[PDB]
Design a protein around this nucleic acid. Sequence first.
DNA 1: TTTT
DNA 2: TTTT
DNA 3: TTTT
DNA 4: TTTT
DNA 5: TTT
DNA 6: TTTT
Lengths: 106, 102, 105, 106, 99, 102, 105, 99
Amino acid sequence: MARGVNKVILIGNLGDDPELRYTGSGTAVCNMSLATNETYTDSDGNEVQNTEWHDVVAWGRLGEICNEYLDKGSQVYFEGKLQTRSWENNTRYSTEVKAQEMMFLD
Amino acid sequence: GAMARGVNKVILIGNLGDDPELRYTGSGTAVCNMSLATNETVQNTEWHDVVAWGRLGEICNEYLDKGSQVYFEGKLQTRSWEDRDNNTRYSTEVKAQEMMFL
Amino acid sequence: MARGVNKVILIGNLGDDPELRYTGSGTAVCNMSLATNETYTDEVQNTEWHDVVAWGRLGEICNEYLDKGSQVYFEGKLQTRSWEDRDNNTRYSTEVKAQEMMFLD
Amino acid sequence: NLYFQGAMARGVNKVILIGNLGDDPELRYTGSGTAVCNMSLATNETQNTEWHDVVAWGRLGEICNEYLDKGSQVYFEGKLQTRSWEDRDNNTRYSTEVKAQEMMFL
Amino acid sequence: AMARGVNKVILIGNLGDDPELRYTGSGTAVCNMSLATNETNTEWHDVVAWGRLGEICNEYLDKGSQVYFEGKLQTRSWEDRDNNTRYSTEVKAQEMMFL
Amino acid sequence: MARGVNKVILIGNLGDDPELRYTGSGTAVCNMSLATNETYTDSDGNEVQNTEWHDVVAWGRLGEICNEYLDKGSQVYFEGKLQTRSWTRYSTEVKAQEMMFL
Amino acid sequence: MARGVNKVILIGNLGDDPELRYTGSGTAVCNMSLATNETYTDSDGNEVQNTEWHDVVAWGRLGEICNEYLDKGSQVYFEGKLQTRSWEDTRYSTEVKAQEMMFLD
Amino acid sequence: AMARGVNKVILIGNLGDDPELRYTGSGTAVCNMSLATNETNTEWHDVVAWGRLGEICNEYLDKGSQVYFEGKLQTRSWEDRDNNTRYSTEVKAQEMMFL
DNA sequence: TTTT
DNA sequence: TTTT
DNA sequence: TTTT
DNA sequence: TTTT
DNA sequence: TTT
DNA sequence: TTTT
């Protein structure tokens, strides 16, 4: 039984080849930049394209799966959760989607 | 153009960490900024910056208080800005399109 | 890695008290009838009824904590099982198999 | 100043599907010219396969039938709907479909 | 027990085109027909028949056939490209006579 | 001799008070929203209510008489014919030929 | 308003040719015998055919039209109302008084 | 599933007396009613309802009640003492609504 | 069968 | 949007 | 009935 | 940075 | 900061 | 008396 719902659903294209690093533990961490492309038509008739860039991160086996199958430009589906991680010269924060499910859409 | 070119969907259920803040633009449009905690159990919390425009923002600021359980559906949006050290810094919101008070 | 996406999200109210049955192997199975209420103006209130099934430990938590009228959140997958009637006419029923649940009262 | 309803949802009924069509879309028209497109969609997992009746109205259903074919990969967002009928034994019967509100050809 | 309402349509006219038959995922027949009723102008009705009735309709009726239907009025709604709520009314058939 | 049959029989309750108008000629047009309530019992013992909503229209003296003896909630009998009119959109409605207040 | 509802819907076949008469005032009165047929399968597997017979009468022009276009065996649609007319012998016959008629052959 | 005839009666009127309910030797209920329908003349219809439908008529309907019936026409015959075949037409109720 |  |  |  |  |  |  859950005590909250924190769910993100993305379909888009990667902007660069996935990056793989490992934690101090030896666990795989795959960082990916994803563009979601929305395009509507304004009251003047223009097609306005609007892109949003997301930082998607996949851990363990799923990240390994991401690093191998996905490439720059790949169309991909992600289900995940929002989290804001800190990092460092001083402290700065980033909001990223931690993937729970990935589907290669070619 | 009825086909979608992407999907950018957020779904949140949690509680407000403080009372909503409501402001108006010069033209009078309402903007309601809120901080939403989502809980997961390990006892861990996640904090989200949610923003609601228009009537949806007025209804939030009137019906919700600190601790209110609430459902949001929205989309992710990142804004950028430049600090005093001339670095480009980013900030991510959930822009709300739907709300249930629960 | 996923070979498809089959996701349902429901926020609604239980139509009746959940029923908890057990399979031959002892696995708990909780069947629930959930109403989702939508409102639009021309004030039109059109409910949709969903059969929601919860297996194992989660089924037991629904049977124990949920009651008729409970506001509840479900996340699940769409699936259509078959069953039988008076004769041997196979009958079909689409239902949401629950993967997460949050009591909202 | 004054409006007909509040802007708060009264419930959530949300379906998300990615799969492949089992057959070419079937497009028909009501007496009034309104298009109705019925499609059968397979979602696969591990091999297991669920079949969904998806229906799309208006220009969305015309778009479905002009772009999608048998085996096409497609994303749908819609709502769950059950409609009923009576068989010749006078037993009330149910059939559940997904009414599509968004479609992405993949 | 006792009925709590009455919703009844009686139609005699001629089909505008050949019936169309489809099946749901589970194997249920759904047959859609457009029926014309004539008066002393002409009214068109969308008629749907589920299950075996649908199958029998699709087997026995063709374009131009004179047919009798008994059914009930049903309206469905949907949202268009502009997010307006729209409505579509059909006669869900319960009896059928080929004439 | 009739060339076709196009008959609708309804017993229901109005969902709102009747709406009376007049043509240019002074001819009443009475538009009503009628709910026909069906109720069956399902396998699990729930008694299920399914409501259908109909647009009924009455002309002339019958329209005047509907606006006169019927309110929101009134249970009423209607006999009429199916019609689809334009306004470019379409609505299927029941043009009443008989009415009886119950 | 109507004050009452008295309505009969019939589809069936005439058992004989329509009989036409005129009243002292000159009004056409056409009398018809109509068979409605009903088939069902019983629990023993038999296909049970039954038949009800109705006295249908049309007045005025419709009676003359019935008398002209309908023969024995003709399949016809009738809309009308129930009436019980008395006649000395004192007897009563319940008949359907046609209001609408459609020739289905 | 295709009909071969239509025998449909629709009545709205007022009872003439209280419903008379009896039971067969097997315990089956049969309710016999006298229904008045008015045109402003008054027509009278023997309505008969079986099973629980007849019981619900007997429990809810009284001498002047306004009631709706759906049913089918049926004529029974008998032989008087002059050996004439006599006919009696009743409405067998299949649906009923208390108004 | 729910809820507001 | 009604009604039990 | 699709897909890998 | 992607992609139509 | 919520729960 | 009809009709399949």
